[PDB]
Amino acid sequence: SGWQAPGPNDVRAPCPMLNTLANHGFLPHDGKGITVNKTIDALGSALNIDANLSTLLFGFAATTNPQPNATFFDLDHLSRHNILEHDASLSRQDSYFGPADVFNEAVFNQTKSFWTGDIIDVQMAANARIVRLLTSNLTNPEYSLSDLGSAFSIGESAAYIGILGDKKSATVPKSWVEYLFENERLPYELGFKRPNDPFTTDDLGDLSTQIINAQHFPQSPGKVEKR
Ligand code: HEM
Ligand SMILES: *[C@@H]1O[C@H](CO)[C@@H](O)[C@H](O)[C@H]1NC(C)=O
Ligand SMILES: *[C@@H]1O[C@H](CO)[C@@H](O)[C@H](O)[C@H]1NC(C)=O
Ligand SMILES: C=Cc1ccccc1
Ligand SMILES: [Mg+2]
């Protein structure tokens, strides 16, 4: 009632949030034929993401459809290596090792170990992202991260803090984030409520700046701050 696991013909993405909105039916349950109007309405209805930001994200998602100048995408188009999907994900392995779309327990265990507290703050988020970049560079001989991939990696850590939690304190309960990644269901039962205030492109930019500012390398090894 309100949630159903993907069945045999349903397609899913490397994005835990889109997978979640498909499992709840905010997006089409089968993960196919997502248009700009469906995107605005799903992200609006479930999370209170503003239309300007939903439109921007749809822009990128549409570039993953193999058909050129496309006006829709499917969730599985998003899995195409090095368009939006990138190495050093928090809950997925690098394509080099295996399929980069499904939840990977080994990788997620690394990420969790840097959330050292019941409340995840900007510092813990920044720290987990950084260890995934460094781990992927030293274990994956085909490791790469484009300027777009770097921007998306920083944006993705800002998102789970800002959209799932309180964007003002820039904090989110650890148990809410763990539940979303592990179940691809919204943690309503743990206290998650759709926020009253819309989440905008400038909220995303600001939190991305806080992530960058909380990185303290004596010397940056590779692409750790590109936007
Ligand atoms: C149309 C909207 C969206 C698109 C097209 C999209 C696309 C993507 C893609 C392609 C990835 C994979 C990047 C990688 O290799 O790690 C991803 C990851 C992610 N997305 Fe989304 N996403 C969208 C909306 C959101 C929203 C609203 C959130 C809010 C919480 C979100 C949270 C995340 C997170 C946390 C990850 C990281 C997963 C991981 O690192 O393992 N996304 N998204
Ligand atoms: C991740 O941690 C769980 C729970 O602590 C542990 O039992 C499991 O073996 C770990 N998974 C991997 C593949 O490391
Ligand atoms: C991998 O690490 C080295 C630092 O030894 C750096 O030169 C390179 O840019 C890194 N690759 C990426 C994509 O960050
Ligand atoms: C890839 C997911 C994402 C989600 C929100 C903002 C930037 C990126
Ligand atoms: Mg990835």
* Start-to-end C-alpha separation, the chain: 40
> What DSSP state is assigned to residue 85?
B
> What DSSP state is assigned to residue 75?
G
Task: Report d(CA 33, CA 51) in Å as an integer.
Answer: 19
Q: How far is the CA of 221 from the centre of ligand 1 (A)?
A: 24
Look at residues 51, 90, 109, 38 and name the one whose alpha carbon lies nearest to residue 211. 90
Q: From the CB of 178, is ligand 2 less than 6 Å away?
A: no
DSSP reduced 3-state for 12: coil
Look at residues 160, 112, 134 and name the one whose alpha carbon lies nearest to residue 215. 134
Residue with tokens 């709840």: 24
Q: From the CB of 152, is ligand 4 less than 6 Å away?
A: yes
Q: From the CB of 104, is ligand 2 less than 6 Å away?
A: no
Those residues with Cβ within 8 angstroms of residue 120's Cβ, 6 or more apart along the chain or in another chain: 160, 161, 165, 171, 172, 173, 174, 177
> What DSSP state is assigned to residue 78?
G
Task: Report d(CA 89, CA 92) in Å as an integer.
Answer: 5
Cα 103–Cα 10–Cα 100 angle in degrees, nearest 5? 30
Annotated binding site for Mg(2+): 85-86, 89
- C-alpha Rg value of the chain to the nearest Å: 17
Burial of 109 (0-12, 13-18, 19+ CB in 10 A): exposed
Atom of ligand 3 nearest to the CA of 87: 13
Q: From the CB of 62, is ligand 1 less than 6 Å away?
A: no
> From start to end of the chain, where are the E strands?
119-121, 171-173
- 115 near 174, Cβ under 8 Å? yes
DSSP reduced 3-state for 91: coil
Atom of ligand 4 nearest to the CA of 163: 5
Task: Report d(CA 60, CA 55) in Å as an integer.
Answer: 9
Burial of 60 (0-12, 13-18, 19+ CB in 10 A): middle
Query: Which backbone phi and psi does 172 adopt, to 5 degrees?
Result: -155, 135
Task: Count other C-beta atoms under 10 Å from residue 125's C-beta.
Answer: 30
Task: Report d(CA 205, CA 2) in Å as an integer.
Answer: 32
Q: From the CB of 87, is ligand 1 less than 6 Å away?
A: no
Look at residues 104, 65, 77, 66 and name the one whose alpha carbon lies nearest to residue 88. 104
Q: List residues bridging with 166 in a β-sheet.
A: 171
Start-end of H helices in 8-65: 16-24, 36-47, 51-62
**Both structure tokens of 60:** 């990128």
Domains of the chain in sequence order:
16-214 (1.10.489.10)
- 33 near 74, Cβ under 8 Å? yes
Start-end of H helices in the chain: 16-24, 36-47, 51-62, 105-113, 122-139, 147-162, 174-183, 201-213
Task: Report d(CA 152, CA 165) in Å as an integer.
Answer: 19
- 107 near 149, Cβ under 8 Å? no
Task: Count other C-beta atoms under 10 Å from residue 65's C-beta.
Answer: 18
